[PDB]
Symmetry: C2
Subunit: 137 residues, 2 copies
């Protein structure tokens, strides 16, 4: 289930984080606009840029903690506020997160491993709702 | 306290894992023999190698799972048994683990961050006790 999936991801987190974030950026090319240093690079080139590896691992380090603290796939309101207030995420909207979680669920469905895809989809929609309630456009 | 400390470490797990493991290997140079690949390499050389980061992150990910499942800094017997039975821990003794936790607590006390160093000391001693009860020499 969802709790075991958190442990599976954490067990190889650097690999999963880069693979999932690349699937996001390739499914939604417009989303690279937000990074700008990522344009014109192939996946293997991004995987050798310091700011790409470090940002993606910190994204998923925190996302797994938010997932871990959730009740029934519903995140804590304090975790949603933390995500909305980070100066880095000024100028982001719930749509950027929605698209990230579409890519994540599609990656899990294609992977062949025993992920609880449907729980991740619910978690993503509930996170988006909490971000809005916390003030994000 | 202890639970917050787990969240702090998990937030930047690769960085903390490398720095703490290097402190261990440099405080106890004889322990570096258990890692034939790491002999004859400076700290920056080790951080340069992908295998080093991957290994130290996987060590500390499991340590944080064991810490999170503990009650009052006492690990589950089942978690200790796992650590005893792992192939890669063949030939290890409890003294190896004791030394790792001395280095961890010292790193925490010197870090200038608000770690609960006393709880990590207690957890390390209780884990060494559990490893012996689980069969480790
Ligand atoms: C659960 C979802 C997410 C979490 C937990 C998360 C977490 C984080 C964290 C912890 C940082 C700071 C890293 C550092 O300072 O080194 C960060 C930075 C950043 N994140 Fe997010 N992030 C999420 C979703 C997103 C999405 C969907 C986008 C864009 C589409 C995004 C864009 C950025 C940018 C642009 C930065 C700084 C550059 N993040 N993020
Ligand atoms: C709570 C403490 C520890 C945990 C949670 C832990 C966990 C792990 C894990 C998950 C791996 C496989 C990683 C892959 O890649 C591993 C490998 C290994 N560990 Fe441990 N470990 C701990 C303490 C130690 C100590 C104290 C030693 C020796 C001083 C040690 C020696 C090794 C060795 C030699 C390997 C194989 C690395 C290559 O080959 N570990 N450990």
């Amino acid at each position: 289930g969802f709790k075991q999936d958190i442990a599976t991801l954490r067990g190889d987190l650097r690999t999963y984080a880069q693979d999932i974030f690349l699937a996001f950026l390739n499914k939604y090319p417009d989303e690279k606009r937000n990074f700008k240093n990522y344009v014109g690079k192939s996946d293997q080139e991004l995987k050798s840029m310091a700011k790409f590896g470090d940002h993606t691992e910190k994204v998923f380090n925190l996302m797994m903690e938010v997932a871990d603290r959730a009740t029934d796939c519903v995140p804590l309101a304090s975790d949603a506020s933390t995500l909305v207030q980070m100066k880095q995420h000024s100028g982001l909207t719930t749509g950027n997160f929605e698209k990230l979680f579409v890519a994540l669920v599609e990656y899990m469905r294609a992977s062949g491993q025993s992920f609880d895809s449907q729980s991740w989809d619910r978690f993503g929609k509930n996170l988006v709702s909490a971000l809005s309630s916390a003030g994000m456009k």
